[PDB]
Design a protein around this ligand. Structure first.
Ligand SMILES: *[C@@H]1O[C@H](CO)[C@@H](O[C@@H]2O[C@H](CO)[C@@H](O[C@H]3O[C@H](CO)[C@@H](O)[C@H](O)[C@@H]3O)[C@H](O)[C@H]2NC(C)=O)[C@H](O)[C@H]1NC(C)=O
Ligand SMILES: *[C@@H]1O[C@H](CO)[C@@H](O[C@@H]2O[C@H](CO)[C@@H](O[C@H]3O[C@H](CO)[C@@H](O)[C@H](O)[C@@H]3O)[C@H](O)[C@H]2NC(C)=O)[C@H](O)[C@H]1NC(C)=O
Lengths: 117, 121
């Protein structure tokens, strides 16, 4: 099937890399206005790609924890944990370096993921 | 007037944009470990410099922290913050420090890891 000319095709997924900045929620929506969900990563192969095509630039990823509750993706499901989420916030972002937590207020870039059919 | 490799210059002040993430107090430290201090926006011109010196996806701590008592925003330089400069976006409770995005200034959890933004003469 493939993805459009703005999206990048990686395996069974299509990713969108932001150009301008937004808050976490302003982004959660955006992916949805393309029926997607803030680039939720699941395999170990995806991870590398993301950090790799993002480096020094920070992006949102849907993972979030609702007030002490527990980190949970955009779709539906509790986050297992094959990877740390340093920071101690409620919204996670991706740098080539790693992924940290934030209050999701800061206006930074994001990434969208959506099953490639 | 100058500073080592990778240190922009706007007037008598130098600026290292760290490179790794560290709890606010940690960076304020790291700056000191290089005879410098965490950013302290003297005035609008200094702001309208770090501001559009940050490419989207880039941000960092600064000499602005909450106070716990009065529960305000003050600079590590020991002078109250003023609406004549700007105004943090987010809760303004103790345990909260500031970080700057290319567009505005948000409020974050000091117990968190972010890249610093050090200055000095
Ligand atoms: C992320 O960015 C959003 C805007 O780009 C920001 O604000 C959204 O915009 C309006 C206000 O401008 C909110 O509307 C609500 O608040 C007004 C003012 O009190 C009420 O009168 C309305 O009834 C309404 O409830 C939106 O609700 C708001 N978007 C959200 C979060 O729902 C968002 O708040 C920003 N999100 C974050 C992370 O804080
Ligand atoms: C909410 O989204 C989650 C992540 O998108 C999803 O879990 C993930 O589901 C995929 C789909 O199968 C699993 O991937 C496995 O299958 C692919 C397809 O060939 C192969 O590359 C591998 O065999 C791979 O293991 C992920 O394992 C899984 N992620 C994990 C570890 O949780 C949830 O199911 C979604 N929740 C629902 C149902 O709404």
């Amino acid at each position: 099937v493939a993805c459009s000319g703005d999206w990048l095709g990686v395996r069974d997924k299509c990713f969108y890399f932001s150009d301008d900045t937004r808050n976490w929620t302003a982004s959660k929506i955006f992916c949805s206005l393309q029926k997607a969900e803030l680039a939720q990563i699941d395999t170990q192969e995806d991870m590398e790609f993301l950090k790799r095509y993002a480096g020094t630039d920070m992006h949102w990823i849907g993972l979030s924890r609702k007030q002490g509750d527990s980190w949970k993706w955009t779709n539906g499901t509790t986050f297992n944990g094959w990877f740390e989420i340093i920071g101690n916030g409620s919204f996670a972002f991706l740098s080539a370096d790693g992924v940290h937590s934030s209050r999701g207020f800061i206006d930074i870039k994001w990434i969208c993921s959506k099953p490639k059919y | 007037y100058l500073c080592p490799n990778d240190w922009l210059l706007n007037e008598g002040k130098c600026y290292w944009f760290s490179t790794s993430f560290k709890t606010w107090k940690e960076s304020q430290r790291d700056c000191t470990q290089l005879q410098a201090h965490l950013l302290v926006i003297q005035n609008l011109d200094e702001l309208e410099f770090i501001q559009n010196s940050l490419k989207p996806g880039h941000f960092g701590w600064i000499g602005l922290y909450v106070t716990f008592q009065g529960n305000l925003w003050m600079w590590i330089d020991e002078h109250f913050l003023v609406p004549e400069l700007f105004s943090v976006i987010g809760p303004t409770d103790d345990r909260s420090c500031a970080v700057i995005t290319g567009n505005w200034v948000y409020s974050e959890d000091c117990s968190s890891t972010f890249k610093g933004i050090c200055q000095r003469d």
